[PDB]
Structure formats: C-alpha cells, structure tokens
Amino acid sequence: GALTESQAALVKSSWEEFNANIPKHTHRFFILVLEIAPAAKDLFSFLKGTSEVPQNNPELQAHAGKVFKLVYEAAIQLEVTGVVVTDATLKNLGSVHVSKGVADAHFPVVKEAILKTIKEVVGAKWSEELNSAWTIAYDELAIVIKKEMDDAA
C-alpha cells in the first residue's frame, strides 16, 4: 500500500473519529486488552487492588488516549515523508515500560486491541484499503517503541 494520499486521508479521518470519544474508546480498549490477556491487569497501578476496569479513572483515560494519538501521527508522517521519526518522548516511553514490567509479546495484544477498536470506531466505511493503512501505521510505530525499551532495559 505504502501510504498513498488516499490511504492517509483514510487514517486521519478514522482518528478523528476515535478522539471524538476518549472515556469510551479508552475503557473499550482496556477491556479488549484484558480479553486478549487477563494477567495484564497486575501491571496497571490503577487496575491493581481493583476487580473491574475503572471507567472514570483519570489516570486510565489520559494514558490510553495518548496511545492512539501517537499511531495516527505516525501514519501522516509516513505519507508525507515516507517514514516514522523517533523523538525524546518515544525514548521516555520506552523507560517507563520497562519499570512497569512490560515485554514485546505484549505488542500484538495492544495491536489487535487497537485494529479491533478502529474497526469498531469506523464501522461501514471500513475497507481493506483502511485496515491496511492502520496496520501499516501501528506496525511502523511499535517498531520504534520496542526499539526504545530494549534500549532502557
């Protein structure tokens, strides 16, 4: 696919749809995660000592929102420039993941959780062309953070 002017136009459009409902899309995202892997729960300070995923936890929202924003930015950056650029932030991200005890095999958990989350977000406008575009953008961004973890470990 590569990321045509037409494919990028498709990710932008679909991210705008995600941000449009943070407390929902972020809580959905945590549940998809715990469905794909339950053990993940002990990781999160704000999930530990709980029984269910808190729904109005500021910490949870702020944090999951940041995740999706980062994947979208990555897709534009691919169409324009042809690449995903590693900055200060991506590097600090890599540190904190390691402290919290997160590994690589965790990443397809959060990917499927995100493709499924975006399929649920765009509904009928879904195309092969679009799936192809988010997949390209996640893959390309995971490649970068995993890189920074390994570096923090």
Ligand code: HEM
């Ligand atoms: C490209 C994919 C990913 C992106 C863009 C991403 C992004 C982030 C960001 C931005 C934060 C810090 C939020 C804050 O300090 O304000 C964070 C924290 C965290 N992330 Fe990720 N992440 C990704 C994949 C993963 C994976 C695969 C896991 C493992 C299940 C994970 C587990 C965690 C945990 C445990 C924290 C600490 C939360 C705390 O205890 O309060 N992340 N991530």
Ligand SMILES: O=Nc1ccccc1
């Ligand atoms: O996947 N990374 C996450 C970031 C912040 C909170 C929870 C998860």
